[PDB]
Symmetry: C3
Subunit: 337 residues, 3 copies
Amino acid sequence: ATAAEIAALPRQKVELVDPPFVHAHSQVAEGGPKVVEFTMVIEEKKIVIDDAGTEVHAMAFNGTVPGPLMVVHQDDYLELTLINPETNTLMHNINFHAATGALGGGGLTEINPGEKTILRFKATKPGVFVYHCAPPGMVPWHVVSGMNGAIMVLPREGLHDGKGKALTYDKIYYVGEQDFYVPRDENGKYKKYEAPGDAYEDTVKVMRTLTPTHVVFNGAVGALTGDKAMTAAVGEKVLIVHSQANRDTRPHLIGGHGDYVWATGKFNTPPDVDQETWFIPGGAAGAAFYTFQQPGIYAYVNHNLIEAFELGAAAHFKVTGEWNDDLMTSVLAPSGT
Amino acid sequence: ATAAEIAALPRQKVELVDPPFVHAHSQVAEGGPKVVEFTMVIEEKKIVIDDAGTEVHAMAFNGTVPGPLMVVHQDDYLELTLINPETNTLMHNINFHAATGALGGGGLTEINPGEKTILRFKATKPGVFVYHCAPPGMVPWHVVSGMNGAIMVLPREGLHDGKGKALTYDKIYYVGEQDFYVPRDENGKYKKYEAPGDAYEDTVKVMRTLTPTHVVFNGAVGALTGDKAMTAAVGEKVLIVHSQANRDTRPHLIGGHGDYVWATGKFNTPPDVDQETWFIPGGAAGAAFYTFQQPGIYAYVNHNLIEAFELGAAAHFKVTGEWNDDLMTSVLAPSG
Amino acid sequence: ATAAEIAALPRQKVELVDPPFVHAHSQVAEGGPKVVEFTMVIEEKKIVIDDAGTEVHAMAFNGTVPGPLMVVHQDDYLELTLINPETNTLMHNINFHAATGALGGGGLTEINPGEKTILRFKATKPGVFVYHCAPPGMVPWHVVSGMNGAIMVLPREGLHDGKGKALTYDKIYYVGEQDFYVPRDENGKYKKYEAPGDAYEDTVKVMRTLTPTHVVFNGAVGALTGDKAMTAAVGEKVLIVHSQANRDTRPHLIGGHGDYVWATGKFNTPPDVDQETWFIPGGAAGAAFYTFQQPGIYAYVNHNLIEAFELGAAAHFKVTGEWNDDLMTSVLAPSG
Ligand SMILES: [Cu+2]
Ligand SMILES: [Cu+2]
Ligand SMILES: [Cu+2]
Ligand SMILES: [Cu+]
Ligand SMILES: [Cu+]
Ligand SMILES: [Cu+]
Ligand SMILES: [Cu+]
Ligand SMILES: [Cu+]
């Protein structure tokens, strides 16, 4: 398309919502290609990542870890206004794995505190894709400080299974998984720092061990539990988009399955089916589609069970509906031999 | 199926066999859906896992690490009686990744020492699937103490390739891979404990490093080597089911291939072909089909070679038959 | 084929070149099956792997880490002359994941210093495949000393997508990724040694932590940058072959994609498409095909970003051509 043709396209402003929720969108595209406009302000901010009160100096797109999910359709243009407020201390940028050229956009979006930039790219490939900050010389430090999220580029005709049958979800959640590398003192207790920069050298040491201290969903141990548990009902079709910008994960819905899993995150690659545990390599997003069949509590985890239950990578679903004794029944409840 | 229809299905008891062997079964289903009955007794016992006398307080379905492979067909029911003897000291349960609801069954099967339970579930999805104990709040500890196995839910019409041609194995083995996290004293010597709970805090510290001290098949270094090597013959078709309930692995048949590999373990997902090394994520089972073409010794390993040859994740096959010089020949033997 | 039939086939001698370049070859086979002849000399040599002058006692096929890429077509025979000079100190051999029997060839190729051997195998399965040394009892040590490479067995009709459409590359590069485990002294400084055997015990201790000190392409931090950046132009189709003989990796072309990726490395397994980051398990090779659409610098990384940017797993592409503002444009450049 020419500059004139792109200028002629309709514009649509989108208001982002915080993960694990996803902004309003249509599964099947409404009309022809559009220029879809998003705005995010970067916030360097202290966050608490566990019940003990462990602090991280987060670097957060739109003030959240992960950054919010942006949704467009194939061959739309994504136009992001990215703002680095003067209250921040570092240069930041953005790299979309969905985009083509200039390192995913990082080469065109280097902004110092007090600067903004507007990047437009054509969403040429359908799938879920990571985005993250990547300042030359400081790449993993920004990413593992939480400066990452994902986008979804839906096919214009919505999702289909590997054989061309439509797959329409009732609801969608975005689970961003974060590996954190928090320095410890000689007592083995987590350290706190005055400024983000004070934590650099100690943190790099931990990063080099390749062993995170915390592996969390939505920025903290237990963030998607209790009154923040995800919800569904028997019969409800749910898409769960999962990203990890730096490190492998292996998602598993305990008590359920991934009926269709785009494990590579890319919708022109046919989905795997009937999955127990799927695998998403660091630097990627994946998506699983499931129809709930049983009520009750589910745990959605990274199925390295140490990572899930010792390091924090566990979320819950609360599911309403009627129990199905055909699928599963307690023939004899625990009782004396 | 209606209530009377489910109640009318035949019930069949099956006797289990210790890994890597697999109980008798048919690849193509015999007759209509059945309720297939298994029984397992949980054993808490000390096992020795290496050549240095290193001990683990194992938590073992049916007394083995891994637990035995249960085989059913799609839309059968699996009905397990699980028994926790009063001589044990921990609560246990069971979670089948093949099952739907109640965390895979764990929510319905929490049994204290001196209790039993019976769980039934419908095997709605074909594939190999992990099962493991998962007491809330102590999940990874039970699993990395060896309390895991797998099941196979065969399609009612047996296995097929991506093009619908039947794939019929002559034999099947089940390799369960176990990551252990054994505490060491400040001299680097592995520690021993009186009771399983005594090791809990020290073990969790090791677990949190995400670095196993041992990675083994069938519960110990060299368990499937030497006089306990698996066997085959040239021309024989072998299915190798492999599971890892907690941690990634990358199986490789040294000297062979995975001709067809269901790397995700699910038979409705077409198999990869001609594989050198396949990948099974922690919390899953996979299966590889191979027709042996050369005799001699093979090594079957996790192809992180440090995990295989320093930490224990290496098995052998001994294969009989005639050497094929077309496939491979020594044109000039090692010489000065 | 019979011995007589094989003896009658045409022979072609190949001259190998240093990675990341690949020796002259045709994508579509030229004529019927041939016996393709290669020669490699093993060199035990010091390599410097970072800008701090850190040394590895490399065990290098053809003097490079990785060893060179060998290219044949399906149902050709690969005939390798392998030489272990008298100047070396250790026994070596070679195991081809592409081959069938004798552990991939290792059982037939054990050569002491001053010996040579010739191995022939039939390349029956199309794909990219790891090769590596594997002396019984010292397997991972040789591998993580850089003694590994890959081969490509092209289909006789060249590459195709999952729907039978031809995929023809303009350029091919081979990136061998290496995990190193370098001992450190009490002050955290990397140790140096004056013979390969002197490093053994210290190196095994680091290996057992499963935590590499360095993760590098082409044997060194920054190797495939600057004078060794890979090159292309807008419109050019490039195949990137990537191997890792011991440890998982997750390749990613920063600023681009893998348009078609044989993540398992096997050409009869249809490629994944539109990939952001693909996954290659330790013990395997994979290949990605991409058509460049933008000029500029690209980084090609293992997308564990600590591995890429702290431990060394980062390469560059320098791409010439016209910028495409439809694909991407700066609507407002960084400004107050
Ligand atoms: Cu990236
Ligand atoms: Cu599980
Ligand atoms: Cu190998
Ligand atoms: Cu940054
Ligand atoms: Cu940043
Ligand atoms: Cu248990
Ligand atoms: Cu060697
Ligand atoms: Cu060797």
